[PDB]
Amino acid sequence: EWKPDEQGLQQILQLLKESQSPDTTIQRTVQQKLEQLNQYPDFNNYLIFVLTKLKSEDEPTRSLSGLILKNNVKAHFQNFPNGVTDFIKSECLNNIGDSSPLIRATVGILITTIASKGELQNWPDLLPKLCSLLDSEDYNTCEGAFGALQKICEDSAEILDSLDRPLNIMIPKFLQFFKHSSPKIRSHAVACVNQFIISRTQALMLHIDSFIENLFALAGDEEPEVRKNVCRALVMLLEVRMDRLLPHMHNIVEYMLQRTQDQDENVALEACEFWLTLAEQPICKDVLVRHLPKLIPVLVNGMKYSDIDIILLDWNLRKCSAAALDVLANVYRDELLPHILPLLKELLFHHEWVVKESGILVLGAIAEGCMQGMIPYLPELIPHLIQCLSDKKALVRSITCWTLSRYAHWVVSQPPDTYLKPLMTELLKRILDSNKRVQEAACSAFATLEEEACTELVPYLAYILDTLVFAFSKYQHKNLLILYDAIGTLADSVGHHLNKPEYIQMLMPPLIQKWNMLKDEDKDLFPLLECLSSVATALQSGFLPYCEPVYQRCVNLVQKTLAQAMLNNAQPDQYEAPDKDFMIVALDLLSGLAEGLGGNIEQLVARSNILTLMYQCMQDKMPEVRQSSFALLGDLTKACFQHVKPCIADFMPILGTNLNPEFISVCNNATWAIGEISIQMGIEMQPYIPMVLHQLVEIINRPNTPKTLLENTAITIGRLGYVCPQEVAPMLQQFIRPWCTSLRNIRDNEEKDSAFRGICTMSVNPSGVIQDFIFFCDAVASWINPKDDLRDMFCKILHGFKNQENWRRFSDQFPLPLKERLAAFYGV
Amino acid sequence: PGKMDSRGEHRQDRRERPY
Numbered sequence: 001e002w003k004p005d006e007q008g009l010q011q012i013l014q015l016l017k018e019s020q021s022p023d024t025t026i027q028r029t030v031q032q033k034l035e036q037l038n039q040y041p042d043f044n045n046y047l048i049f050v051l052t053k054l055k056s057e058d059e060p061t062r063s064l065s066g067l068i069l070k071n072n073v074k075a076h077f078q079n080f081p082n083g084v085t086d087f088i089k090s091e092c093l094n095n096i097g098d099s100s101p102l103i104r105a106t107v108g109i110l111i112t113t114i115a116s117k118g119e120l121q122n123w124p125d126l127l128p129k130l131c132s133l134l135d136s137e138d139y140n141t142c143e144g145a146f147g148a149l150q151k152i153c154e155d156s157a158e159i160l161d162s163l164d165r166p167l168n169i170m171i172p173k174f175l176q177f178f179k180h181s182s183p184k185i186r187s188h189a190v191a192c193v194n195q196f197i198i199s200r201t202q203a204l205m206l207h208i209d210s211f212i213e214n215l216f217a218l219a220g221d222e223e224p225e226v227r228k229n230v231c232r233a234l235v236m237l238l239e240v241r242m243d244r245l246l247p248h249m250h251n252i253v254e255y256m257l258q259r260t261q262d263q264d265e266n267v268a269l270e271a272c273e274f275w276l277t278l279a280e281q282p283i284c285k286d287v288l289v290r291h292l293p294k295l296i297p298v299l300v301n302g303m304k305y306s307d308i309d310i311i312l313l314d315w316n317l318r319k320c321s322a323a324a325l326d327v328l329a330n331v332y333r334d335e336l337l338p339h340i341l342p343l344l345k346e347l348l349f350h351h352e353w354v355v356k357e358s359g360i361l362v363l364g365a366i367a368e369g370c371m372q373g374m375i376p377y378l379p380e381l382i383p384h385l386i387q388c389l390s391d392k393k394a395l396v397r398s399i400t401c402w403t404l405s406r407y408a409h410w411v412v413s414q415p416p417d418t419y420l421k422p423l424m425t426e427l428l429k430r431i432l433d434s435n436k437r438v439q440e441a442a443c444s445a446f447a448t449l450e451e452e453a454c455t456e457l458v459p460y461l462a463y464i465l466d467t468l469v470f471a472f473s474k475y476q477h478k479n480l481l482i483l484y485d486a487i488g489t490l491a492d493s494v495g496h497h498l499n500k501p502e503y504i505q506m507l508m509p510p511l512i513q514k515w516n517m518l519k520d521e522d523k524d525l526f527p528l529l530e531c532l533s534s535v536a537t538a539l540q541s542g543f544l545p546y547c548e549p550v551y552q553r554c555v556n557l558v559q560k561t562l563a564q565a566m567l568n569n570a571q572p573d574q575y576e577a578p579d580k581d582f583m584i585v586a587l588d589l590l591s592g593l594a595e596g597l598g599g600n601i602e603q604l605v606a607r608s609n610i611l612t613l614m615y616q617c618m619q620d621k622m623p624e625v626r627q628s629s630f631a632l633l634g635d636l637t638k639a640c641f642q643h644v645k646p647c648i649a650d651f652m653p654i655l656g657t658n659l660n661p662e663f664i665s666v667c668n669n670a671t672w673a674i675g676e677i678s679i680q681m682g683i684e685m686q687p688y689i690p691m692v693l694h695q696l697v698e699i700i701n702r703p704n705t706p707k708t709l710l711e712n713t714a715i716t717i718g719r720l721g722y723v724c725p726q727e728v729a730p731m732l733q734q735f736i737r738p739w740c741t742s743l744r745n746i747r748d749n750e751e752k753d754s755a756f757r758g759i760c761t762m763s764v765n766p767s768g769v770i771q772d773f774i775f776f777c778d779a780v781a782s783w784i785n786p787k788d789d790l791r792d793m794f795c796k797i798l799h800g801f802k803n804q805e806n807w808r809r810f811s812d813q814f815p816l817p818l819k820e821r822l823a824a825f826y827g828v
Numbered sequence: 829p830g831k832m833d834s835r836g837e838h839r840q841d842r843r844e845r846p847y
């Protein structure tokens with residue numbers, strides 16, 4: 001019902017030739033003319049006509065016409081009338097197997113793009129026609145149709161069930177082309193089926209036996225693409241249907257071991273993944289019993305840098321082998337050392353740097369699983385690695401930074417002058433390496449060391465800050481991020497020691513300079529603001545000269561992220577949803593300012609809409625947003641409650657709804673906020689207690705709840721009982737056991753103090769304490785340095801229980817430190 | 829303690845690693 005005319009054809013052919021001209025500007029001119037014509041449907045009818053039917057014209061003009069149309073599909077398919085679209089569809093399927101490889105590639109890319117963009121529900125007979133075309137006599141047609149089906153399976157596998165269950169016909173049919181004579185078709189066949197293994201697609205699982213028998217029959221295929229796809233198949237079958245591989249495990253392991261050494265590096269990388277996946281299964285040790293002795297040297301050998309990467313310098317046989325060795329070391333732990341140590345001896349001291357490098361990487365990879373077993377060798381290895389940090393080849397320096405980092409805990413545990421002092425000295429020198437890959441390795445290692453050492457670095461603080469600040473001049477972009485993180489960690493590790501004028505004036509200027517440089521859309525803000533958050537908590541009162549623009553920018557980031565989210569929610573096809581990391585980062589930095597500046601932030605908050613913005617952040621679908629806003633709420637509750645008090649009526653029900661322990665961090669920050677709000681509410685928190693308490697009690701008696709959530713729940717229940725004993729005390733019998741067991745283990749501080757005066761007051765029902773009194777006695781003995789008020793309180797309840805003497809039988813079940821501290825402080 | 833930062837996890841994930 002549409003046919004071309006010579007005038008229109010000549011203009012298109014003219015325009016298509018012109019688009020192939022070599023000249024500088026005629027190409028920019030032809031694109032503006034295509035831009036205009038692209039939105040006219042009759043033009044796309046001409047494009048597909050040139051591709052499939054103008055066999056007079058050459059191949060490059062025909063296929064370029066098809067590719068321009070492909071771009072129009074990707075952009076304007078919505079606007080295509082159902083008569084142009086059907087004409088393109090029919091011509092594609094009818095020329096799926098053209099004799100020209102370039103034309104055939106172009107038709108398929110059309111098919112594939114219409115199928116995805118425009119959605120398969122709207123091309124109902126595509127899959128049946130493609131499947132019928134698979135049975136064709138002509139090879140190119142069968143190959144081209146299978147080419148399309150494979151792209152479609154890779155792109156749209158998630159349409160298994162409602163076209164209407166097409167996989168129930170295709171998958172059984174793909175399995176029949178595993179035996180096909182042409183290796184190309186065979187690859188397509190198992191490539192298609194591989195898309196549906198992890199899904200446990202019903203059509204495939206009910207044919208799992210035919211699948212497995214056809215895979216075995218294909219194992220010795222000489223064509224790499226088959227071997228590779230057979231290897232992929234076996235690795236996924238390992239994850240979902242281990243049951244049916246079990247009777248063949250010995251031959252499969254034997255096969256994968258051979259393929260892990262394949263001459264084709266892509267085959268070997270697919271094979272190598274088998275070991276990663278097998279290590280997770282509980283059957284691992286039993287299965288590998290006869291092959292582990294060869295697997296370990298095979299893995300270690302593939303960890304060397306390939307020759308290409310050697311010259312160049314992302315996932316490859318090196319990383320995969322290393323990852324496998326890491327997991328295996330975790331599975332076998334010390335049993336692995338007799339396999340690894342001879343290799344390590346032959347590699348760590350080798351004359352050829354590529355070999356030695358791989359030795360050092362082995363040493364780091366096994367560190368976590370084999371740590372205990374290698375303690376005896378560390379007094380020799382660690383001084384050796386510190387010497388390698390000065391090795392002449394950069395890649396040896398950078399891997400040595402890493403594996404030293406993997407032994408940081410052992411190093412901090414030894415006398416600081418022996419290993420820690422020299423390691424840190426030469427890591428700092430390495431920070432200023434001239435090679436960018438070493439900078440990033442040494443910086444990351446140093447961060448790792450900072451986290452392990454904590455206050456052990458305070459004597460070195462000035463020299464660390466000299467090195468870290470200097471790096472601002474040498475680093476740009478990619479390692480500045482690592483550098484910010486090293487500064488953030490330093491601030492978390494030495495805390496308030498950072499708060500000295502010499503340090504502040506050395507560190508802030510370059511931090512603010514990179515701050516003024518970045519704009520509100522740059523994701524580089526994430527490490528910078530997370531760094532400033534840590535710096536502000538450490539610098540506390542000394543951050544005051546810098547906080548004003550820092551605060552107002554964070555509130556701005558939250559405000560714009562909320563507004564963009566609401567816009568996107570309003571018209572999603574016109575406005576893109578915002579990255580809510582900007583908001584999470586910005587909330588956390590405000591938490592850092594409120595913790596660090598304390599009361600000094602109130603003048604900033606008094607002039608802000610942060611609480612109105614916090615109200616909406618607390619209700620966000622995403623947990624990390626809720627988690628950061630509740631953390632900010634507790635911090636503002638401490639710093640400037642004057643401004644929070646009017647909002648409590650609205651915040652409390654929302655805090656009540658986020659006492660859900662499936663989200664640990666949200667649940668935790670919510671409970672902590674409730675506690676801090678209590679202390680400043682006073683008796684006025686009476687009406688809000690029914691909204692939280694019954695769940696808090698359920699949370700504190702829930703098994704396999706992380707210790708930190710339990711202590712915060714204990715501290716909040718204590719604080720709520722200090723403030724309104726009337727409605728809290730009835731539950732004493734129901735939570736005192738886990739309360740005492742958890743709070744027994746926290747340092748004597750203001751939260752501990754606040755919580756224990758709460759338990760004392762709950763004086764209001766002493767009968768809730770009796771049947772489990774052993775736990776309270778222990779909990780009060782946990783106190784080393786209690787302030788006098790709390791001591792006086794403590795003597796009263798213990799002496800009161802005594803007077804109900806007869807108790808000595810019970811009191812002798814005390815361990816000796818328990819019984820003796822109670823007599824020492826309180827005289828019972 | 830009291831309250832969960834989640835900042836350390838973010839720094840660990842940006843850290844350099846050979847695999």
